[PDB]
Amino acid sequence: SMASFKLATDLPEWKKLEETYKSVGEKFSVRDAFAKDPKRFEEFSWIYKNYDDSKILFDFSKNLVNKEILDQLVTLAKEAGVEKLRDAMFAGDHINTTEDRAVYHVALRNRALRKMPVDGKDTAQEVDDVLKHMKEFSDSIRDGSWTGYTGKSITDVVNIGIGGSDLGPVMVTEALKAYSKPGLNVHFISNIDGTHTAETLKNLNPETTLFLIASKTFTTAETITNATSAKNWFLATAKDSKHIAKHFAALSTNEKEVVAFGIDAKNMFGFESWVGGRYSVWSAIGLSVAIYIGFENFNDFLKGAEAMDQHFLTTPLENNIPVIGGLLSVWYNNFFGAQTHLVVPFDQYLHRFPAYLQQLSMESNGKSVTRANVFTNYQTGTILFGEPATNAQHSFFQLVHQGTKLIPADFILAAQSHNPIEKNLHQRMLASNFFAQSEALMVGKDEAKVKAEGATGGLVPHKEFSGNRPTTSILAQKITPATLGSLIAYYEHLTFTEGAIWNINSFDQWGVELGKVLAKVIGKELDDKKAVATHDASTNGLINQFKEWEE
Amino acid sequence: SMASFKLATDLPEWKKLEETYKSVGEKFSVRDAFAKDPKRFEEFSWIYKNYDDSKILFDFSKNLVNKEILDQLVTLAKEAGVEKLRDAMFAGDHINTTEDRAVYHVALRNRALRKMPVDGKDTAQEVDDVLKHMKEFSDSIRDGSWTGYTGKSITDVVNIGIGGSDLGPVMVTEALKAYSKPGLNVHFISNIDGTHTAETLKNLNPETTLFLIASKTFTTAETITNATSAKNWFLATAKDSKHIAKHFAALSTNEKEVVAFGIDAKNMFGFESWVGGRYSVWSAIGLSVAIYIGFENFNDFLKGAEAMDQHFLTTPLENNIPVIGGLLSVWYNNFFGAQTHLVVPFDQYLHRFPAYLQQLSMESNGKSVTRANVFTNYQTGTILFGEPATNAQHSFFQLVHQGTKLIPADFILAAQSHNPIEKNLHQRMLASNFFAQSEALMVGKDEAKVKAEGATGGLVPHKEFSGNRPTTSILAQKITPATLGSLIAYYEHLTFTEGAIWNINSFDQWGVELGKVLAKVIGKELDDKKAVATHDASTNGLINQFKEWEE
Numbered sequence A, B: 001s002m003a004s005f006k007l008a009t010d011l012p013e014w015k016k017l018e019e020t021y022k023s024v025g026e027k028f029s030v031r032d033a034f035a036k037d038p039k040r041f042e043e044f045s046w047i048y049k050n051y052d053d054s055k056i057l058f059d060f061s062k063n064l065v066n067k068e069i070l071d072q073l074v075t076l077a078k079e080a081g082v083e084k085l086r087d088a089m090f091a092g093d094h095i096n097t098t099e100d101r102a103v104y105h106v107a108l109r110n111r112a113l114r115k116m117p118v119d120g121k122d123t124a125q126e127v128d129d130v131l132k133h134m135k136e137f138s139d140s141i142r143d144g145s146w147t148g149y150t151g152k153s154i155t156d157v158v159n160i161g162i163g164g165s166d167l168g169p170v171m172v173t174e175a176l177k178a179y180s181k182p183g184l185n186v187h188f189i190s191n192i193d194g195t196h197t198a199e200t201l202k203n204l205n206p207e208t209t210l211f212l213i214a215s216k217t218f219t220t221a222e223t224i225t226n227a228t229s230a231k232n233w234f235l236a237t238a239k240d241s242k243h244i245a246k247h248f249a250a251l252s253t254n255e256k257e258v259v260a261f262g263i264d265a266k267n268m269f270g271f272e273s274w275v276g277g278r279y280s281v282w283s284a285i286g287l288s289v290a291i292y293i294g295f296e297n298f299n300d301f302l303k304g305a306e307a308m309d310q311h312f313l314t315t316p317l318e319n320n321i322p323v324i325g326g327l328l329s330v331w332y333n334n335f336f337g338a339q340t341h342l343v344v345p346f347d348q349y350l351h352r353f354p355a356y357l358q359q360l361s362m363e364s365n366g367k368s369v370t371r372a373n374v375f376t377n378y379q380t381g382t383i384l385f386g387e388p389a390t391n392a393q394h395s396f397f398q399l400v401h402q403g404t405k406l407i408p409a410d411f412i413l414a415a416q417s418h419n420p421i422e423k424n425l426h427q428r429m430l431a432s433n434f435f436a437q438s439e440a441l442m443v444g445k446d447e448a449k450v451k452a453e454g455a456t457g458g459l460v461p462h463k464e465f466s467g468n469r470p471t472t473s474i475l476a477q478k479i480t481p482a483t484l485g486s487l488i489a490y491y492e493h494l495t496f497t498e499g500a501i502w503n504i505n506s507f508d509q510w511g512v513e514l515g516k517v518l519a520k521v522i523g524k525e526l527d528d529k530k531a532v533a534t535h536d537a538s539t540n541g542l543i544n545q546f547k548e549w550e551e
């Protein structure tokens, strides 16, 4: 086995952390910790400096953690060989053991052109060549030199893809929308549900719309179905297949399929097998971002990830920010038994950031088998969810404050808004909520205070707050491309750390296969007339009721 | 002392369910259940008939449940007085004990004009009179009789509101978008973040834009600030405040505060204290819906809720669809220890259905104190999350299939699409996924089958699927206004059932109420130049770093 251990439960520090949980962690008072340690904020906060000298404060000090606990977690990370696995990742080793592949999204943002080899062959130029092609193409869309079949500049660009071929481009174009150009819009078709195509294309002009079909194989069923429907929409107006070439490009490897579809092979933008879908927005898959906000902005976004990569690679564990966040996740997941991880951006542009992180985290770390090819009998990936604040405060934060579940939470705010309207009034209000919510989760409100505030009798307990509910606060200066690049890479490397401790392979996804195969079988049965009796009674029942109700 | 018991855990059936969990529940085999009971699908599926003779199938047969378990859960619901509390709700009794209020969203959709009294006075005509006002005004926007200040038809309707005054309008306008009219669009400003105002208003015309200021209290900080900024934007162009009367209306319980803001009382659409925000889309708060899709569609939506209300009120517990769903939730939450509940619509229109439910569910049932005014010694509300499929399948279903967490899931499909493009090809593909994903989660794939399919040695465990992962499948004919009204009411009444069992108040929200009075202290500190030391060191550190980095 390439693995140095079999199960996380084999590592000696695991039982020590179980005993620390019992003695110190279960009943941990964050209030008391601040009272005990005047330097607590200093000790449990870190400033990250980005390549452009901008900064991001990572404040972990309201978590259920102290020096003793964090030191034990760092010892666990050493026993798990986090650093060895990380170094092997950056070395190009095939640490995706089940697919026998490198894991080399870090090579996508190698703008410094460090030597970064796979199979002993540097990748730096091959990556950089695709980025230069991306710059050329995106520049031609943005400056009007690429025209549609009637000689008009492009106004709308539609990405068609599923999974990692959609969610990154969506989230990042939403997040960086302040950097867009009036009159050049992006759209994202992903669902096979034909609503998604019908509603997206309804008001678009075939003469000025450009499609990017995002699929490595160019044989992905939902994506190629969507792509074919979009091609039919285009041709309903254009009425000649020769026009396809001015309106369709591919984010793909499969030149025979692309060319068959009517796309000029010159307009295929490739990426390698060592790019995982949920780690792919840094690749050719990011073309829609480069078109929307310009290549130089996209490049700055890459350089922010690169800087965080360098932090992760070169920092001792006890000061390594993505490591610390991963260690705290393990602490809550495996010792407190918290099943979820909340992420709340106090930022409307970042409204799809939690959904992006949900794929990154859950698709990576929802695994039950270790690198030693044995079943875990301990918890692995958490369920990650969230919505932006302040909206979230009005809604499920009720349960975060007064429910019976521990919900570790990360709050994210920019000190500066891209839209500082009304002399920054909205922004000072937004910021006050950021600070106040984490404060309230810590401090709570005891029975005496509820009484002082005027409640009596049976009403009193209903108005109490436990406090000692943990948050991590992440304050950026401004959510620029660079900042966003660093923030995603933070979560990539947090996700890495978690998976390394659990000894899982964070980079495969075998779990998609069964439902795909079973869908193909059923699809054939939905094409046929007859009632079905080939499945369990529920599946048969559902299919047969559908058949009675369908068009 | 209105309560009939103190703690769920001390209901006599609770310990009997713990024993059943140990003996039959924990190791329940759904596969064996089907093999034992040839009628399992029929026994654990129910057809709901709506008022319009349309139908929805609720199949619970892939859950970890049998007759023995469900009969115990029904006994538990009887011991908890679910029926007595529900009857009190429908009588207008003040079952919201902590706020001393009726809970009477059911009266909002009383289209039959049954006697439904609060404080011994029928509400039927008062509710109906507001619906007539809504019909009049929405008709006048749609037919062009309500013009803007330069005599033009309204093209854009902007709702401004947050939480319960936002998420319903968002979700239902998205869900029922097939029923909208070209050239009449809706928009939703909610976040205090100035991005939300700036981006929403960027390309709208004040001459053809109508604002609905949606606030139960009409004092919410975010909303009143947002509404003031919108008025500033309007007056920048319109100049004369007399024009406001054509461009601003209010949805509220507080006439004095509306008129104080400068809105004419003739343009207020009222509701009462007994409408909770997360149950409010049925009231005046739904005006954006009636404008977008027409009042008759909105009325059909109400009538769907009313039909599900009648089902809930009149059906013995063992066949009562919302109750069965709530009983399964308690089973998973309290006996299996599953902390989450996944809701996945196989429907892109329903993309905001999970987020809406997240509010309804978590804000209702995230409580730690019972109706007997003692703290619980057991779990209450679950964490509800989800995204539409097929996007969700390609995001996080890896973990649903192969992770270490039990995640009870509800899947929802319509048999007929509003957009059956390409002769229903998309729709058949979408449906195949709906059936296959629930099939896959149940059947799994054992070691022998993985080997038969070609894996050897250490690769084998990585490709296994446990199966016996539960789902509920909900199959509608078509997601019409009526179907959606029934679906929401289903989840309202499921939420009621959970809360009744847990003996919590599902209708207050003392955490969300705190939130709305938290930020003002810090807000005053951000207005002042100086550094602060008035909080814990973390809050101080974050505020002071912010002050160094702000505009």
Ligand SMILES: O=C(O)[C@@H](O)[C@H](O)[C@H](O)COP(=O)(O)O
Pocket (backbone or CB within 6 Å): A394, A395, B162, B163, B164, B165, B214, B215, B216, B217, B218, B219, B220, B223, B276, B277, B278, B363, B509, B512, B516
């Ligand atoms: O669920 C709730 O009570 C909140 O989300 C409210 O709906 C939100 O705070 C808005 O309150 P109001 O409608 O009074 O402005």
Ligand SMILES: COC(=O)c1cnc[nH]1
Pocket (backbone or CB within 6 Å): A224, A225, A226, A228, A229, A232, B422, B425
């Ligand atoms: C591959 O999908 C198709 O064949 C298709 C046909 N019509 C729309 N899409």
Ligand SMILES: COC(=O)c1cnc[nH]1
Pocket (backbone or CB within 6 Å): A422, A425, B224, B225, B226, B228, B229, B232
């Ligand atoms: C009520 O909020 C305000 O005073 C405000 C001022 N400018 C925009 N909003």
Ligand SMILES: [Cl-]
Pocket (backbone or CB within 6 Å): A333, A334, A335, A377, A378, A379
């Ligand atoms: Cl564990």
Ligand SMILES: [Cl-]
Pocket (backbone or CB within 6 Å): B032, B033, B036, B065, B066
């Ligand atoms: Cl059984």
